[PDB]
Amino acid sequence: SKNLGGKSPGKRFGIKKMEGHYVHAGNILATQRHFR
Amino acid sequence: FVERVPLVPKVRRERKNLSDIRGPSTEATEFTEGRFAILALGGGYLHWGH
Amino acid sequence: YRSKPTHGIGRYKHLVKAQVRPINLGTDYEYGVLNIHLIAYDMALAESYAQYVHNLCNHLAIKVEESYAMPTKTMEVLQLQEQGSKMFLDAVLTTHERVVQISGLSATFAEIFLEIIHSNLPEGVKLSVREHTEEDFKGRFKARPELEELLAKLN
Amino acid sequence: DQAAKDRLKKRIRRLEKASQELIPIEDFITPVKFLNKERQRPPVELPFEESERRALLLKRWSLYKQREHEMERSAIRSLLEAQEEALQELRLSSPELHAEATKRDPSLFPFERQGPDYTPPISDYQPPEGRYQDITKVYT
Amino acid sequence: DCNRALLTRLHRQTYARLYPVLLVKQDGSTIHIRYREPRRMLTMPVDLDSLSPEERRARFRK
Amino acid sequence: SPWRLLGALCLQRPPLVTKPLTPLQEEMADLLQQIEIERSLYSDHELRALDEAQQLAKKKSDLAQDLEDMWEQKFLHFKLGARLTEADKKDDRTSLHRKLDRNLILLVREKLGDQDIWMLPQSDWQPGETLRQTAERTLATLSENNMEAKFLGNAPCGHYKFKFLGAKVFFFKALLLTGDFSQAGKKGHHVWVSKEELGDYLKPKYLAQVRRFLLDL
Amino acid sequence: VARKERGWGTVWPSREFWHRLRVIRTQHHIEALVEHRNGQVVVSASTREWAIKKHLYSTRNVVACESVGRVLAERCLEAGINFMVYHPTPWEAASDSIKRLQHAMTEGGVVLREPRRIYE
Amino acid sequence: RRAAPLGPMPNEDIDVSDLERLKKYRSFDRYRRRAEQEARKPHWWRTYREHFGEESGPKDRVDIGLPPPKVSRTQQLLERKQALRELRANVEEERAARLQTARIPLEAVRAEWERTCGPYHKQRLAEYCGLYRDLFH
RNA sequence: GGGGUGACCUCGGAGUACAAAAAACCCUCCGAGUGAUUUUAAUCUAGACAAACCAGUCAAAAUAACCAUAACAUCACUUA
Numbered sequence: 001s002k003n004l005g006g007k008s009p010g011k012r013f014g015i016k017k018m019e020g021h022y023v024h025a026g027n028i029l030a031t032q033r034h035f036r
Numbered sequence: 037f038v039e040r041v042p043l044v045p046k047v048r049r050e051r052k053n054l055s056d057i058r059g060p061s062t063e064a065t066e067f068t069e070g071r072f073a074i075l076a077l078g079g080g081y082l083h084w085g086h
Numbered sequence: 087y088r089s090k091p092t093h094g095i096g097r098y099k100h101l102v103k104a105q106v107r108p109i110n111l112g113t114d115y116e117y118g119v120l121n122i123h124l125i126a127y128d129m130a131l132a133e134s135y136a137q138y139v140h141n142l143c144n145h146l147a148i149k150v151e152e153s154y155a156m157p158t159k160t161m162e163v164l165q166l167q168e169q170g171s172k173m174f175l176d177a178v179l180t181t182h183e184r185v186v187q188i189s190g191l192s193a194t195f196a197e198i199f200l201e202i203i204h205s206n207l208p209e210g211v212k213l214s215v216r217e218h219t220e221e222d223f224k225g226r227f228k229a230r231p232e233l234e235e236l237l238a239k240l241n
Numbered sequence: 242d243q244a245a246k247d248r249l250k251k252r253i254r255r256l257e258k259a260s261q262e263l264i265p266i267e268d269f270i271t272p273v274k275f276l277n278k279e280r281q282r283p284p285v286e287l288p289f290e291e292s293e294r295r296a297l298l299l300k301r302w303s304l305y306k307q308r309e310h311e312m313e314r315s316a317i318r319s320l321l322e323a324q325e326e327a328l329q330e331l332r333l334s335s336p337e338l339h340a341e342a343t344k345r346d347p348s349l350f351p352f353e354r355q356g357p358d359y360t361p362p363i364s365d366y367q368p369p370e371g372r373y374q375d376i377t378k379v380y381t
Numbered sequence: 382d383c384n385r386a387l388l389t390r391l392h393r394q395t396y397a398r399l400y401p402v403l404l405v406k407q408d409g410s411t412i413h414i415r416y417r418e419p420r421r422m423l424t425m426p427v428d429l430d431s432l433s434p435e436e437r438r439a440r441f442r443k
Numbered sequence: 444s445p446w447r448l449l450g451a452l453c454l455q456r457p458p459l460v461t462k463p464l465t466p467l468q469e470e471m472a473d474l475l476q477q478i479e480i481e482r483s484l485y486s487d488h489e490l491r492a493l494d495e496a497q498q499l500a501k502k503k504s505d506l507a508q509d510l511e512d513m514w515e516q517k518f519l520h521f522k523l524g525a526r527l528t529e530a531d532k533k534d535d536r537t538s539l540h541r542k543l544d545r546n547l548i549l550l551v552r553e554k555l556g557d558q559d560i561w562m563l564p565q566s567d568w569q570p571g572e573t574l575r576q577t578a579e580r581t582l583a584t585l586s587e588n589n590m591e592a593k594f595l596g597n598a599p600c601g602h603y604k605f606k607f608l609g610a611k612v613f614f615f616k617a618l619l620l621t622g623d624f625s626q627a628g629k630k631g632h633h634v635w636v637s638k639e640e641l642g643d644y645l646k647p648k649y650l651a652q653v654r655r656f657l658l659d660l
Numbered sequence: 661v662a663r664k665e666r667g668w669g670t671v672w673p674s675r676e677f678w679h680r681l682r683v684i685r686t687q688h689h690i691e692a693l694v695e696h697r698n699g700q701v702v703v704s705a706s707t708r709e710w711a712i713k714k715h716l717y718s719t720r721n722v723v724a725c726e727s728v729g730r731v732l733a734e735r736c737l738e739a740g741i742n743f744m745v746y747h748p749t750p751w752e753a754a755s756d757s758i759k760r761l762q763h764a765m766t767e768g769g770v771v772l773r774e775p776r777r778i779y780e
Numbered sequence: 781r782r783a784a785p786l787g788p789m790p791n792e793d794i795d796v797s798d799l800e801r802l803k804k805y806r807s808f809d810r811y812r813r814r815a816e817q818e819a820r821k822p823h824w825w826r827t828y829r830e831h832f833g834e835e836s837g838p839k840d841r842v843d844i845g846l847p848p849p850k851v852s853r854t855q856q857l858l859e860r861k862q863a864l865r866e867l868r869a870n871v872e873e874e875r876a877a878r879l880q881t882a883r884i885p886l887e888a889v890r891a892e893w894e895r896t897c898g899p900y901h902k903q904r905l906a907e908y909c910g911l912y913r914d915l916f917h
Numbered sequence: 918g919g920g921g922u923g924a925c926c927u928c929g930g931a932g933u934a935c936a937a938a939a940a941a942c943c944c945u946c947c948g949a950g951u952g953a954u955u956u957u958a959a960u961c962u963a964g965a966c967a968a969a970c971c972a973g974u975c976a977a978a979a980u981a982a983c984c985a986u987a988a989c990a991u992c993a994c995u996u997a
């Protein structure tokens with residue numbers, strides 16, 4: 001009707017590696033929209 | 037006198053949150069300056085007719 | 087996180103806010119804002135005393151609402167030439183005014199403040215401590231020609 | 242009769258919704274008359290002895306201004322503590338007088354004040370004659 | 382304490398030369414004013430203070 | 444314990460002339476004038492003076508001074524009012540025009556039955572009166588003249604108590620706008636006085652502390 | 661070849677160094693430290709020290725700043741530190757005292773701009 | 781769900797209400813000093829030093845060496861104040877400091893340094909280079 | 918919420934969906950189908966995000982040219 005375009009998938013913005021995880025060089029630790 | 041519609045009408049339609057009726061009241065539970073009052077033993081909606 | 091004991095450690099918007107009628111109770115007479123005007127023919131002296139009173143208020147912890155300048159009033163001196171029947175230009179006097187707007191003051195502190203200002207008043211300066219009213223606010227604005235003509239044709 | 246009043250009130254409201262910008266101050270703006278004399282002003286060639294005496298005078302002036310500020314603030318503190326002692330004595334003596342004195346008088350709104358002069362006024366002095374006129378600009 | 386905020390100058394860049402003119406108002410007192418046109422003294426006249434009666438009186442006495 | 448209450452008025456006449464400059468302030472004024480003349484761009488008077496001095500010099504090979512001389516002669520002819528009005532009398536210590544560089548206050552002489560005190564103007568009031576109105580009525584009836592005084596604030600400026608049964612005196616400050624003191628050749632000894640002569644005259648300890656809340660200037 | 665502390669990028673100053681020059685200019689004294697990445701002060705030169713206090717008047721001025729820079733350069737040459745970083749504020753880098761301090765430190769042998777890490 | 785802080789919160793002491801009468805620092809340098817002073821305190825939450833090796837925090841180091849020289853602090857301060865007054869009483873030193881043309885006796889500075897405070901600087905430099913850690917542990 | 922008429926069909930932001938992620942309606946509201954400016958913004962390659970697939974995203978080290986101390990083009994809710 002009047003409300004259009006409200007359909008958009010989530011960008012999966014979150015924390016990938018938690019505290020204690022052994023990571024390697026280049027591993028993305030966390031993605032975010034604003035500086036969290 | 038209480039107005040039926042506020043001076044600025046809400047143009048955006050809001051969902052009917054029934055949580056504002058569900059549960060105990062947290063505000064206006066004690067006396068301010070009077071000595072008697074009308075206490076509500078349940079939940080509901082008050083409109084201009086009431 | 088919400089359930090962690092370190093919740094709200096970055097909470098900062100409550101430390102800064104970035105988004106006056108007279109309060110007379112008889113004992114704590116903290117009236118409204120006050121306008122202190124310093125008027126002088128010497129622009130340098132007017133600015134000097136404006137800076138001085140501003141720094142004095144800042145040291146005395148008096149909340150200064152504003153520190154502005156009013157439009158200059160330029161008067162023309164027309165002297166009567168000798169033998170009468172003439173008016174010739176002598177000079178022109180440019181009168182400046184600097185206004186400091188403070189917020190709060192008590193009776194005792196206001197008395198002490200007026201004491202200090204009138205004791206440190208330089209030569210050739212008019213000091214006027216008044217209340218900030220609607221006419222004092224509208225004085226530093228423009229002509230309402232259309233608006234006054236509209237009121238005239240309405241009345 | 243009525244449509245004219247409607248248009249009148251409409252124009253009134255439209256003019257009221259406008260801005261209320263202030264008068265530009267002729268002191269903070271430099272006139273165009275000061276653009277032709279900047280090339281004709283010769284330098285000063287300040288000498289070393291004058292520079293040194295000026296620096297010494299500036300240091301002495303800083304010290305003197307500091308001392309003046311200190312003594313003025315000491316006098317202010319003395320006056321303030323005397324005022325607090327007087328108010329506490331009044332509060333101890335009688336509360337009614339303290340309550341009626343802790344307010345502001347209705348005669349303090351139009352506080353006018355004038356500073357001293359270079360010479361005292363001369364008795365039986367007469368300004369010869371002359372009229373005044375205001376040549377200040379207008380703005381809309 | 383009258384000479385506290387008196388010892389200053391013009392704190393602007395582009396400005397003309399001003400001179401300490403002695404201005405005397407309609408009282409008999411003088412003040413020092415920074416003013417161009419280095420006339421050693423300026424006099425402030427008056428012709429609008431009193432009403433028509435005193436105006437005619439002064440005109441006849443002059 | 445009986446209690447007696449009294450108000451008192453401290454009237455200040457402000458200085459009408461400016462104080463002389465300390466030599467340090469004079470050196471600072473000379474330096475400031477020098478640097479102002481230096482940083483100045485140009486004045487129309489000196490501009491036209493140099494213009495004339497250049498055009499005449501180039502025309503003799505091919506005024507501003509008059510105006511300056513006229514102004515200098517007018518300044519020499521005009522005589523200003525005498526800033527010193529006390530060094531010529533040296534006798535009149537009760538005149539309002541005694542001192543012009545400092546602020547003065549008024550002292551009245553009173554010889555009571557049991558006390559002979561050089562006392563500041565005091566009054567007495569019933570519990571139905573205010574202290575400010577008491578000081579106003581004091582300056583109205585005791586001074587015996589029509590003088591206009593400006594009261595600063597409603598709060599008292601000084602408080603002094605003494606017990607014999609006790610008494611309290613509350614000193615309120617006031618500023619003088621204009622004083623028309625009639626009947627000046629009276630026996631009532633009223634004197635206008637500066638801070639040093641106050642410290643010289645005032646003998647008692649309760650009145651020797653008026654300098655605590657009175658500005659020194 | 662040591663592991664520099666790459667990282668923050670959002671906060672200031674950058675912690676990617678081995679040694680770091682820090683100049684604190686109080687209202688009375690001037691203190692030039694050379695800190696390691698862990699925060700410990702390796703070599704410091706202060707106007708509060710008697711050696712410079714008794715030899716210098718007005719321990720705050722630009723002369724004193726240049727003096728403490730020279731003394732720190734000599735002490736760094738003695739300690740064996742030749743490279744460090746200096747990250748001043750945009751208003752401290754344009755000042756007169758800090759410019760002369762940097763010039764004196766450079767002339768004393770201590771060169772800023774720590775070398776690039778091999779295989780960073 | 782909410783948990784209680786395991787100690788004092790950082791900005792819990794200043795009053796939230798009536799912020800205008802509260803003094804602020806208008807200097808980035810002032811804020812940087814305050815932040816670098818607050819960052820060195822042993823907070824109860826997870827900090828950077830705890831993870832990146834503060835070296836067990838505070839340690840009671842055993843002192844195996846000669847005692848410090850017992851000097852009269854009062855007489856020392858008196859003679860130092862006298863020397864400073866004598867240095868400030870001159871006028872050529874003031875002229876040199878004003879003209880920004882003044883040199884320093886670096887040799888005498890180094891001598892006085894190694895006489896009064898050089899030992900402590902050498903001690904901290906050896907602690908940094910790890911001499912004690914491998915000589916006495 | 919039978920078809921027809923009406924409306925919509927792709928992309929992004931907020932709520933629904935309160936705290937890792939995802940999450941629908943012909944659910945409630947904003948927007949996009951580009952402008953302006955110059956710093957005209959490369960090659961190669963570890964390791965990762967996201968995802969049915971197609972597509973989308975980051976990016977250390979190494980290389981050529983500029984300070985011999987940056988290069989992620991910036992702004993318009995920048996996300997479209």
Ligand SMILES: [Mg+2]
Binds near residue numbers: 006007008
């Ligand atoms: Mg969505």
Ligand SMILES: [Mg+2]
Binds near residue numbers: 007008009010
């Ligand atoms: Mg979806």
Ligand SMILES: [Mg+2]
Binds near residue numbers: 853856857
């Ligand atoms: Mg000591």
Ligand SMILES: [Mg+2]
Binds near residue numbers: 918
């Ligand atoms: Mg159906």
Ligand SMILES: [Mg+2]
């Ligand atoms: Mg259709």
Ligand SMILES: [Mg+2]
């Ligand atoms: Mg995955």
Ligand SMILES: [Mg+2]
């Ligand atoms: Mg790279």
